[PDB]
Amino acid sequence: GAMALKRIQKELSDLQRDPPAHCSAGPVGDDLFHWQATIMGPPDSAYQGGVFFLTVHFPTDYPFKPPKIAFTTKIYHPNINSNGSICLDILRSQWSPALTVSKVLLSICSLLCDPNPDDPLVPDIAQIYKSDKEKYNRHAREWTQKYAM
Amino acid sequence: DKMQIFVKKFWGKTITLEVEPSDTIENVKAKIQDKEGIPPDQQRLIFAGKQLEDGRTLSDYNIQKKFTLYLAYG
């Protein structure tokens, strides 16, 4: 995956030269194909103040196949399950080689600000987001304080 | 001996600090409190996706001139 490696090195370098405001990321160890990333809950959302860790596993065909991105921090959300798996189209069918890990992480932040109740990876939480925002925001706030702060 | 690093607040602006490689992460938090008034126990410092431990030094993390840390405060 040398061409994948060259592109991973470029994304890494771009993060250093122009640090984005929504994420911090880098290799876990000496293997550029495995990263750890940190995002914070978007401002004025139920996840505000929380730090959420994610793993990023690049494929050898990168950037022509998406990276495997999963939450390691526990989070209350209809599109993220207890295994940290994320239901997000750009990580599956809508991936594009013009996308970067940084752009994907910003989309995940956008998904925290506006969950998608029509892709219920956790049906119960999706029903509550539709039914009762107050209850949803309470549970999402509590899991943030419990697991992400 | 002294050097400059950047601290990027999540969803926020960039702080500049003058530090030494021997400064602890806790020292850095105290410096952030000097400039911003944020108490250390509400700060978490991040580098390249990893949370920095309060007792270690910038040297231990090989953090050098003009590197950028991230500050989570809540």
Structural summary, described in words:
Chain A: Belongs to the ubiquitin-conjugating enzyme family. Chain A: Pathway: Protein modification; protein ubiquitination. Chain A: Component of a E3 ubiquitin ligase complex containing UBE2D1, SIAH1, CACYBP/SIP, SKP1, APC and TBL1X. Interacts with RNF11. Chain A: It comes from Homo sapiens. Chain A is an alpha+beta fold and 149 residues long. Chain A has one domain (1-149): Ubiquitin Conjugating Enzyme (Roll), CATH 3.10.110.10. Chain A is 36% helix and 15% strand. Chain A has a 4-stranded antiparallel beta sheet, with helices on one face. In chain A, strand 1 (24-27) and strand 2 form a beta hairpin. With 74 residues, chain B is an alpha+beta fold. Chain B has one domain (1-74). A 5-stranded mixed beta sheet of chain B has the order 2-1-5-3-4, with helices on one face. In chain B, strand 3 (43-47) and strand 4 form a beta hairpin. The radius of gyration of chain B is 11 Å and the shape is globular. Chain B starts with a strand and ends with a strand. The chains are: A alpha+beta (149), B alpha+beta (74). At the A-B interface, strand 1 and strand 2 of A face strand 1, strand 3, strand 4 and strand 5 of B.
